[PDB]
Amino acid sequence: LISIFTEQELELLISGLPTIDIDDLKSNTEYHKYQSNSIQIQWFWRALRSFDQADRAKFLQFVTGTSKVPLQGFAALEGMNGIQKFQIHRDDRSTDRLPSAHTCFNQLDLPAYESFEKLRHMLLLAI
Amino acid sequence: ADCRALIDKLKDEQLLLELQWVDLLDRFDGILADAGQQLKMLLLAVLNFTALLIEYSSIEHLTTLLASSDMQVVLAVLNLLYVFSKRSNYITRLGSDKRTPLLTRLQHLAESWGGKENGFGLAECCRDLHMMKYPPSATTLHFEFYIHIEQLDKISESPSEIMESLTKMYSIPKDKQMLLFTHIRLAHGFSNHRKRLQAVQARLHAISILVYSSILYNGLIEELVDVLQITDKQLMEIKAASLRTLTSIVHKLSSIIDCTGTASYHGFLPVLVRNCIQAMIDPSMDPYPHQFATALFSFLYHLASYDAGGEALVSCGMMEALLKVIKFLGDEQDQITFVTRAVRVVDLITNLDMAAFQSHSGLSIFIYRLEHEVDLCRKECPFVIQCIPQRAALLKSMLNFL
């Protein structure tokens, strides 16, 4: 009876869906090779704003490894080497591969997908 | 206070009423008892303003003025009697000295025209139709108590003059010539668009007054929905009146829900509300008139208050649009008022479903709006250890929700 949930969904069953302040993440996002005004970043934020609470939570699990929201906000997001902010890196490999996550760095590697729909589709398949 | 200043200013009067209690209401009841026995427009302004004063000894004069050839004044009296009926039981508790003459004049206004089956549905009488696609009996007077005048449109004589001629030419039953007068002024009206529309609006208002306090029928709800679905966009006043009438009727609810379509995200009322909301949020989309939007939200509130309506507003997902309102709407008094209405509606829905509200992060939105309004007060009153009334009502409803 429990085996109907995924490994994400079992966490969401035990600890519940968090409410993700996407505005808090945006206020605590670091862009490395993208820029805060890059077009792929505006597409990223449009997609992430369009995801429902469960897909937002699955994203948070994908990139941080947990649904737990930090009480102080995502500025206090911890990583392997001390407090690590969430971070988006442009994946300069081919754009026919999924985004990839390194949760100990809270790191998303994101190919420069040619369109909103494809980026959203691949991200939704990842989460 | 400023009420007293407005009174002293008023006590150019008609110019001030055009710009916009005891002795001011008494001067008004004066001119009411005077005009009904540069006059008509003063009466119209007195009425249009009095319909605001009651909204924060006139009953007899108002019923006497409900018997007038000019439809403007009839509409104004009806709107005043709608305000009274809707917000307090002033005419319901009244005695039958004048309550019955009133309700009978209202009945003679409200009574059916034959609906769609006979060719006189409300929707048809708002589109022009060229005056040749209506039943030929529209300009035919058939009073029977036996008067069968025909083609009252061809006759150009003033309607009151015709009524007077009928009065002298025949002995009309005593104390019921009102049903003749209303039939004759209707048959004069139906010839032309403005007068047909005004009669439609008067009938709708009369219904609503007669229900907040034989007129209703199976086709009426459909006809009102059809009035709403007209695409002319020049009938917003009629559409608002229809929505108000539907709200009254709610006070058949399963049929209202089945017709309006609130059980599905795609449905006339849901789509209409979402369009009104998007036009209110985004400047580019032309804002739907304030009255129409007010009527829509009032209908939604009056529905949500009933379990069938709250379950329909669950089913169509109106919580997402109403949280959109409470998140993106501006700071101006009308926008504040729409935010308050939305919060009340959300409260009425969340009294039977929480999952939509929670999934839409509603609590965050409510808290952010409370912070935004308190921060806008912080400019006027920064001290921390009078508020604008609309913002205080917003804060009040939102703290009640919390």
Curated annotation (Swiss-Prot), chain A:
Outcome of swapping residue 73 to R: In MRXST; decreased protein levels in patient cells
Source organism superkingdom: Eukaryota
Disulfide bonding pattern of the chain: none
Compartments in which it is found: Cytoplasm; Nucleus; Mitochondrion
Record note on modification: Phosphorylated on tyrosine; phosphorylation is probably required for its ability to inhibit TP53 transactivation.
Positions carrying Phosphotyrosine: 34
UniProt remark on domains: The HECT domain mediates inhibition of the transcriptional activity of p53.
Family in the record: Belongs to the UPL family. TOM1/PTR1 subfamily.
Quaternary structure and partners: Interacts with isoform p14ARF of CDKN2A which strongly inhibits HUWE1 ubiquitin ligase activity. Interacts with MYCN, POLB and CDC6. Interacts with isoform 2 of PA2G4. Interacts with NR1D1. Interacts with AMBRA1. Interacts with HAPSTR1. Interacts with HAPSTR2. In hepatocytes, interacts with PAQR3; the interaction promotes PPARA poylubiquitination and STUB1-mediated degradation.
Protein name listed in UniProt: E3 ubiquitin-protein ligase HUWE1
Shown residues within the full chain: 4238 to 4364 of 4374
